[PDB]
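ping. complex inputs:
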Amino acid sequence: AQCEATIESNDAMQYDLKEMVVDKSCKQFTVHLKHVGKMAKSAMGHNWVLTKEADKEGVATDGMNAGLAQDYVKAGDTRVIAHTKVIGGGESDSVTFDVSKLTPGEAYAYFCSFPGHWAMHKGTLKLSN
Amino acid sequence: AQCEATIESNDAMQYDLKEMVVDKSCKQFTVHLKHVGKMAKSAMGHNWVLTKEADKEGVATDGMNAGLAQDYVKAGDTRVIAHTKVIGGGESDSVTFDVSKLTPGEAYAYFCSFPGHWAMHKGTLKLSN
Ligand SMILES: [Cu+2]
Ligand SMILES: [Cu+2]
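pong. complex structure:
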């Protein structure tokens, strides 16, 4: 069954999916982030960033410190398995990554690194079952 | 009551009051900010900053750049009419300011300068009898 998932953000602080499962038949997985709100990214931009659960607050703060033009993700951050661009209302962005980067059975953190979003705007990703 | 107002913030990005009126008999005005949420201030802290509407973005950018130890307000910022400290869930902080810093007729901007909150977490203050 497919290896692509659409996850949505809006003008509030939550994704519509608090958890995501990457099916084990997949060699590559694409995440399609949609910002279905109406606020511009200067007020309520959102992105989607994937890391080991341990690396989350670190990535999140170096990311906030990287600025809006870097999509609030430190350029070349080794801890980021995959990330989207920061988008604003009515926009989308997608990222594809190699599923071999994930360990079967490990919970991974995904979150938004837009200033003030990482602790609320998050969820957990794992390989199926 | 007289020349005091209480305003609340929670674990989302908005105040319970979108408009605040300072009575014209007031020489001093006190704002009691309460954070009725339960999230940690490094996760979803909030403050209340009052400026002219033309200075809001300048204050919020330099506020952001000032860091949490400065309650995300640049120290000695001339455009800041008044500001609270940044509080987290289950805390409160107050600030009293001199109303002659305000001009009758003008609408003033109050907002939260915590990273990512300035353009959403906001309202208008006006002087009226
Ligand atoms: Cu976000
Ligand atoms: Cu706030």
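Chain A has two helices and eight strands.
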